[PDB]
Amino acid sequence: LYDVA
Amino acid sequence: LYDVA
Amino acid sequence: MTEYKLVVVGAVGVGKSALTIQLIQNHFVDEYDPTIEDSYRKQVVIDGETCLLDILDTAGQYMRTGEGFLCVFAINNTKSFEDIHHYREQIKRVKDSEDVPMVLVGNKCDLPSRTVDTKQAQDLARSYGIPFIETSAKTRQGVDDAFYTLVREIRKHKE
Amino acid sequence: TEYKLVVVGAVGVGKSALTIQLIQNHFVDEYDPTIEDSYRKQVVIDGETCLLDILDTAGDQYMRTGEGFLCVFAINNTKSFEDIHHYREQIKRVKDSEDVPMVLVGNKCDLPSRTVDTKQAQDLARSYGIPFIETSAKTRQGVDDAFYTLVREIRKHKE
Amino acid sequence: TEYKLVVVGAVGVGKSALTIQLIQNHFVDEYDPTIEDSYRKQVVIDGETCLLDILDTAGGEGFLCVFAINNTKSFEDIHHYREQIKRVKDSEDVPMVLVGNKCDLPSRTVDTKQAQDLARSYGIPFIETSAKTRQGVDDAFYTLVREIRKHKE
Amino acid sequence: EYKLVVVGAVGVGKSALTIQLIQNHFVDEYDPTIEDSYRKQVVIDGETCLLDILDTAGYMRTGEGFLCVFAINNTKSFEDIHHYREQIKRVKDSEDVPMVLVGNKCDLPSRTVDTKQAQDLARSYGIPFIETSAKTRQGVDDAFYTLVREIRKHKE
Amino acid sequence: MTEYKLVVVGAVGVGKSALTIQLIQNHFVDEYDPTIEDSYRKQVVIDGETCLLDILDTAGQGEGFLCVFAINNTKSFEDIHHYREQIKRVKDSEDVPMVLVGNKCDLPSRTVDTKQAQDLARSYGIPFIETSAKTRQGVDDAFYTLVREIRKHKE
Amino acid sequence: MTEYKLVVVGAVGVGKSALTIQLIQNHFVDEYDPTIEDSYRKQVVIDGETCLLDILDTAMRDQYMRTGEGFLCVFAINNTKSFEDIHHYREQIKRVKDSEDVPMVLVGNKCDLPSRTVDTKQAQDLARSYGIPFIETSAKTRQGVDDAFYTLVREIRKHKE
Ligand SMILES: Nc1nc2c(ncn2[C@@H]2O[C@H](COP(=O)(O)OP(=O)(O)O)[C@@H](O)[C@H]2O)c(=O)[nH]1
Ligand SMILES: Nc1nc2c(ncn2[C@@H]2O[C@H](COP(=O)(O)OP(=O)(O)O)[C@@H](O)[C@H]2O)c(=O)[nH]1
Ligand SMILES: Nc1nc2c(ncn2[C@@H]2O[C@H](COP(=O)(O)OP(=O)(O)O)[C@@H](O)[C@H]2O)c(=O)[nH]1
Ligand SMILES: Nc1nc2c(ncn2[C@@H]2O[C@H](COP(=O)(O)OP(=O)(O)O)[C@@H](O)[C@H]2O)c(=O)[nH]1
Ligand SMILES: Nc1nc2c(ncn2[C@@H]2O[C@H](COP(=O)(O)OP(=O)(O)O)[C@@H](O)[C@H]2O)c(=O)[nH]1
Ligand SMILES: Nc1nc2c(ncn2[C@@H]2O[C@H](COP(=O)(O)OP(=O)(O)O)[C@@H](O)[C@H]2O)c(=O)[nH]1
Ligand SMILES: [Mg+2]
Ligand SMILES: [Mg+2]
Ligand SMILES: [Mg+2]
Ligand SMILES: [Mg+2]
Ligand SMILES: [Mg+2]
Ligand SMILES: [Mg+2]
């Protein structure tokens, strides 16, 4: 529920 | 990381 | 019985002991070994109250039961003044708390050898709310005021 | 005298930029929406001497003693504008109260690249009575007014 | 189409913390200031596509002379750094940008005045980064490219 | 006919002031761990006097004028002035010794010790202040010359 | 150059240092060790003139003396004559400039009326002000008015 | 942006640098080593504009004495040799630039001294014999110190348009 792309 | 100088 | 367990953090050569041993032992410590730390104590008629300052003149190299810490920099320094965050976040890290009673005091204000204007020595202290005073163990300025104002900060936090 | 505020919102709206333009005074080019400290600053609020211990939340002790929430959307967004109920009810969900002091502000009104007209940014805010303002941390517009107006909302609720 | 940048500065300022935050994306809690690789990354720099092959030195087109806003020694070491860069390139006009790192800290002494009139004493841009926030972190390197573009044309 | 001393820390430019006024060129580097008793005649201030100077690095009894010097691109040095203020008053066991606090190396744009500090401190003894930089020969001679005025004063 | 060498005499507990250090170093000394004394100094734009105050904050154990009592004292107010005649005794003169000031007048816990703090001051001609280092009241005017007394005695 | 590359030519002992370091570094240079010459600079709110004075006290040097957009040819008003080296540094400036129309301003420096011989007449008819403006500076005073540099920009601006 975060990460990057 | 004690030293005198 | 009424008591308080206080700590005195800071760098070496600022005056950590000079405050501990001018408020307690009552005379300007010409020099005290910064590589030792005893847990000093003294009863004083603190604020219309009878309290026992079991202080600790720490030097690194207790700090759980630290009720009120005395994080202290030097006004004729700057390295000691930039170590505030590294002595600040230390105190928060151990107590794992972002609201621990404290007071950042500016020691050795008796020198004209001074650089850290009261501005920096406020906006920073204002940046944790916590009080600020300007001591000088050669004079006994806010020396007692520094410790006394920590007690109120302890009284507050609980209630 | 003191208040412990919170700033809720999505990523990319401006949550911290308001907290770090009212407090630290400069447009933060980019502040990671993945870290949150409990910032603070004393200001001469509204004929009064008050402490804004804010919190730039990014999804304890605060999200309960959140005396006033800065639920904020972006005027050049749309999903963030649509996210405020999941932020509207969240605030009411925890506090289990249908009357919590909050102010819906519209951030980044500095952009001409905008779609969310003031109508939206009113009839929605009129559907909670709580005030609305239009901020932009690149300008410091209603930046202080959003926080200031929240204080009036706290003072009211109690009395 | 690329640019070859360098990052000079003292120990304890945050030379690498910028250099790995903007390239590898995370605040390096502590990077041993005794090593230096020639880092690189492709980014859509400013309406263009360029390759920032950098080098955070510790003891060439655009240097990143960097001081710490919570320092003083590093701030006063910039001539020993601003002459060094001029000394190598035997040129009195080499593109650079003096940035003030780690402005996230309230334990700060170097006011923005110092961190301007000094930068204004070479014209070269000034920003204030803090690799714990990614503030002007990219802005510092991005602005350096602009300084490279100028000098040619 | 004056015996002067140049007190200061390492890295301020103690030697740079003594060898640019006397030997006339910017000393690219002087090994501070050494100290001669340097001298030079100059037609000081409408008068003919001999500057037998001393670039101390840690006379200290006949030091008629101490050139207590800090670096405007330092701070540890500017803070040490008390450690050097009291030194001079300690030896001479006197709270009134002719001196002049000068801010050396004002040529560098990396300056933090503003002229305010470099005055209210100097104002906290009355003793004059100037701003030298041996790369320029600015107040370099002015610092030594104005010390002479302070020696003449104390006597009369 | 223009200067004045002043001395601040009085008992312990009045605030001899609180006036020296609030005029000069600018902040209420919450407490100052009454067993120390430096010869403090400061340049100020005294009275349309550029004069240097090289003061002295004596505690025992000169051009103009700042003989001072506490308005919330009585022992300190009754040592004036002994601090008076001390000043006369050294300068072996009955006409030395000074100014008797009443310090710590910011306190409501006061007993020494302005009457006493005048009839006594009127019994040497020399002025009288009421200072309080917590406020910076006549603090400077106490020192400033001394300079005029020095200027007078000369010409 | 808005930049201007200026040069300060003159003899030794007039105060070429004193004007460069009073306008920029803001204090009276009691004595500056005449054997050195850096390319000083400073941003100022010039004349309803924002311009950058990259100056050069002469005593890259090709790069400047070649794009010296405006030269500050300066004599001392308590001199005469420096005032006679007028024709030697202005032919110099028009030699390199191979131009008889180079923006410049002849200033009379150190007009603070009562020991002056070069009347304002000389210090006009000559400046009138290139049209270029004249002012009277003194770095210990900051008189026309900035006025000399500011008026040079006007001459740079004009020459183009
Ligand atoms: N002998 C000596 N004393 C110093 C030096 N630097 C500071 N002091 C004095 O030492 C006093 C108190 O020492 P302190 O700083 O409390 O020891 P620490 O706090 O454990 O490092 C201060 O009031 C200073 O004035 C030094 O280099 N040598
Ligand atoms: N150029 C650029 N700017 C960005 C980008 N992401 C964020 N920003 C800027 O940073 C702000 C969004 O991040 P921010 O609002 O501070 O995160 P939050 O406050 O925690 O929600 C916006 O105002 C943008 O101007 C990006 O990818 N590129
Ligand atoms: N892991 C760790 N990091 C620290 C500590 N103290 C400071 N830091 C962070 O580590 C960084 C220092 O590394 P850095 O300055 O990048 O090394 P340099 O640029 O090569 O000199 C600073 O930005 C601090 O924020 C510590 O005790 N431990
Ligand atoms: N730029 C530069 N200057 C240096 C270097 N090494 C030494 N110096 C100079 O060496 C001088 C220190 O010696 P000096 O001041 O004459 O000795 P002192 O009089 O006893 O303090 C400084 O003025 C520096 O300018 C170097 O590597 N680079
Ligand atoms: N810690 C402490 N400080 C005091 C006490 N009484 C007075 N002071 C401080 O000492 C200051 C007065 O200094 P003063 O007595 O006038 O100097 P002196 O008269 O020459 O000894 C007052 O402003 C108080 O702040 C006391 O009982 N304890
Ligand atoms: N009386 C006197 N004045 C001097 C002497 N040497 C230099 N000066 C003064 O120092 C100033 C030097 O100006 P400066 O900017 O260094 O000249 P520049 O190098 O040609 O630009 C002149 O205005 C002179 O009045 C000297 O031996 N005697
Ligand atoms: Mg200690
Ligand atoms: Mg954020
Ligand atoms: Mg490194
Ligand atoms: Mg030496
Ligand atoms: Mg006393
Ligand atoms: Mg010159």
One DSSP character per residue, E46-73 reads TTS-EEEE--B-----EEEEEEETT-SH
Domain C3-158 coded CATH 3.40.50.2300 = no
Both structure tokens of F52: 């037998």
Residue D80 burial by Cβ neighbours in a 10 Å radius (0-12, 13-18, 19+): buried
Pick among H20, H29, H30 to test the F interface (most F CBs inside 10 A): H30
Backbone angles phi, psi at F107, to 5 degrees: -75, -20
Largest CA distance in chain F: 41
Both structure tokens of F118: 């470099």
| E runs forming strands in chain D | 5-8, 42-43, 50-51, 68-74, 104-107, 132-134
Against chain E, the chains showing at least 3 CB pairs within 8 Å are C, D, F, H
Which residues face E68 on adjacent strands?
E101
Residue D56's alpha-carbon distances to D29, D71, D132, E27, E134, in angstroms, are 16, 11, 19, 19, 16
Q: Touch between chain F and chain D (3+ CB pairs, < 8 Å)?
A: no
* C-alpha gyration radius of chain D: 14
Residue nearest ligand 2's atom 4 by CA: D30
With CA atoms as reference, report the closest residue to H76 among H123, H121, H40, H44: H123
With CA atoms as reference, report the closest residue to F114 among C46, E144, H26: H26
Both structure tokens of G14: 């009045």
Ligand 6 centre from F151 Cα, in Å?
Answer: 27
- At CA D9, angle to CA D3 and CA D12, rounded to 5? 125
- At CA E23, angle to CA E17 and CA E28, rounded to 5? 30
Ligand 1 centre from C12 Cα, in Å?
Answer: 7
G contacts of C142 (beta carbons < 8 Å):
30-31
Alpha carbons E111 and E125: distance in angstroms, whole number: 16
The amino acid occupying position E97 is V
Angle, in degrees to the nearest 10, between helices E15-24 and E137-152: 90
- Do E67 and E78 contact (CB within 8 A), yes or no? yes
- Do E46 and E146 contact (CB within 8 A), yes or no? yes
For every residue of G102-150, DSSP letters joined together read EE-TT-SS--S-TTHHHHTGGGS----EE--TTTTSTHHHHHHHHHHHH
With CA atoms as reference, report the closest residue to C149 among C73, C84, C69, C50: C69
* C-alpha gyration radius of chain H: 14
Helices and strands (H and E) in chain H: how many: 6, 6
Both structure tokens of H23: 């306008």
Would you give the DSSP letter of residue E115? H
Fold of H3-160: Rossmann fold (3.40.50)
- Do D87 and D38 contact (CB within 8 A), yes or no? no
Look at the alpha carbons of F72, F74, F75, F81 in this order and tell me if their dihedral is positive or negative.
negative
Ligand 4 centre from F145 Cα, in Å?
Answer: 24
What kind and span of H or E run contains E120? helix E114-120
Provide long-range contacts, Cβ within 8 A and 24+ apart, for F18-21. F18/F53, F18/F55, F19/F55, F19/F134, F20/F134, F20/F137, F20/F140, F21/F51, F21/F137, F21/F140, F21/F141, F21/F144
Torsional class of H62: left (φ above 0), alpha (ψ -120 to 50), beta (otherwise)? alpha
The CATH class of D2-158 is: alpha beta
Torsional class of H56: left (φ above 0), alpha (ψ -120 to 50), beta (otherwise)? beta
Alpha carbons G4 and C145: distance in angstroms, whole number: 34
Distance (Å) from the alpha carbon of C106 to chain G's nearest alpha carbon: 13
Give the dihedral of Cα atoms F19, F21, F22, F25; nearest 10 deg. 60
- Do E122 and H40 contact (CB within 8 A), yes or no? no
- Do G60 and G11 contact (CB within 8 A), yes or no? no
With CA atoms as reference, report the closest residue to H53 among H18, H107, H15, H1: H1
Alpha carbons G27 and C19: distance in angstroms, whole number: 20
Residue G143's alpha-carbon distances to D151, G42, G137, in angstroms, are 47, 12, 11
- At CA G26, angle to CA G24 and CA G27, rounded to 5? 135
- Do G57 and G8 contact (CB within 8 A), yes or no? yes
With CA atoms as reference, report the closest residue to H4 among H60, H46, H58: H46
- Do F50 and F39 contact (CB within 8 A), yes or no? yes
The amino acid occupying position C83 is D
Strands E98-101, E126-128: parallel, antiparallel or unpaired by DSSP? parallel
Alpha carbons F19 and F38: distance in angstroms, whole number: 8
- Do E77 and E110 contact (CB within 8 A), yes or no? no
Look at the alpha carbons of D30, D35, D36, D42 in this order and tell me if their dihedral is positive or negative.
negative
- Experimental technique for the deposited model: X-ray
Contacts of E125 (CB under 8 A, 6+ apart): E97, E98, E119, E143, E146, E147
Give SS3 for C157. Answer: helix
Which residues face G70 on adjacent strands?
G103
Stated length of chain C: 159
- Do G46 and G26 contact (CB within 8 A), yes or no? no
Would you give the DSSP letter of residue G98? B
Fold of G3-154: Rossmann fold (3.40.50)
Alpha carbons F146 and F142: distance in angstroms, whole number: 6
What is the CB neighbour count within 10 angstroms for residue G75? Answer: 12
- Do H72 and H7 contact (CB within 8 A), yes or no? yes
Task: List, chain by chain if needed, residues with CB within 6 Å of any ligand 6 atom.
Answer: H 10, 12-18, 31-32, 34, 59, 110
Domain F2-155 coded CATH 2.30.30.830 = no
Alpha carbons G108 and C15: distance in angstroms, whole number: 36
Look at the alpha carbons of F111, F115, F120, F125 in this order and tell me if their dihedral is positive or negative.
positive
Edge-first strand order for the sheet with F129-130 is F69-71, F101-104, F129-130
Alpha carbons E25 and C110: distance in angstroms, whole number: 47
Alpha carbons H24 and H43: distance in angstroms, whole number: 9
- Do D125 and D45 contact (CB within 8 A), yes or no? no
Residue D85 burial by Cβ neighbours in a 10 Å radius (0-12, 13-18, 19+): exposed
What kind and span of H or E run contains H109? strand H106-109
Alpha carbons H90 and H96: distance in angstroms, whole number: 10
Contacts of G90 (CB under 8 A, 6+ apart): G62
**What's the gap between Cα B2 and its chain centre?**
4
Alpha carbons C87 and C84: distance in angstroms, whole number: 5
Both structure tokens of E66: 């960097």
F124, HSE (Cβ side, Cα atoms, 13 Å): 19
Strands D68-74, D104-107: parallel, antiparallel or unpaired by DSSP? parallel
Chain breaks in chain D (C to N over 2.5 A) after: 59
Would you give the DSSP letter of residue F14? H
Ligand 11 centre from E131 Cα, in Å?
Answer: 51
E8, HSE (Cβ side, Cα atoms, 13 Å): 20
- Do D84 and D71 contact (CB within 8 A), yes or no? yes
What is the CB neighbour count within 10 angstroms for residue D46? Answer: 11
Alpha carbons C62 and E9: distance in angstroms, whole number: 39
Residue G77 burial by Cβ neighbours in a 10 Å radius (0-12, 13-18, 19+): buried
Residue E30's alpha-carbon distances to C5, C87, E6, E19, F51, in angstroms, are 34, 18, 20, 12, 53
With CA atoms as reference, report the closest residue to E45 among E153, E150, E146, E152: E146
Ligand 2: which atom is nearest the Cα of residue D11?
21
With CA atoms as reference, report the closest residue to C75 among C102, C103, C104, C111: C111
Strands G101-103, G129-130: parallel, antiparallel or unpaired by DSSP? parallel
Torsional class of D15: left (φ above 0), alpha (ψ -120 to 50), beta (otherwise)? alpha
Contacts of C9 (CB under 8 A, 6+ apart): C16, C58, C60, C69, C70, C71, C72, C87, C90, C91
Alpha carbons F11 and F77: distance in angstroms, whole number: 9
Alpha carbons C106 and F148: distance in angstroms, whole number: 38
- Do E104 and E135 contact (CB within 8 A), yes or no? yes
Both structure tokens of D106: 């519209």
Ligand 4: which atom is nearest the Cα of residue F16?
16
Residue F86's alpha-carbon distances to E129, F54, H152, in angstroms, are 42, 18, 52
Fold of E2-152: Rossmann fold (3.40.50)
Q: Touch between chain D and chain H (3+ CB pairs, < 8 Å)?
A: no
Residue C43's alpha-carbon distances to C23, E126, F104, G10, G25, in angstroms, are 11, 54, 50, 31, 32
Residue nearest ligand 1's atom 7 by CA: C13
For every residue of F63-91, DSSP letters joined together read -SEE--EEETT-SHHHHTHHHHHHHHHHH
E contacts of H54 (beta carbons < 8 Å):
123
Alpha carbons E53 and C12: distance in angstroms, whole number: 42
Ligand 5: which atom is nearest the Cα of residue G134?
23
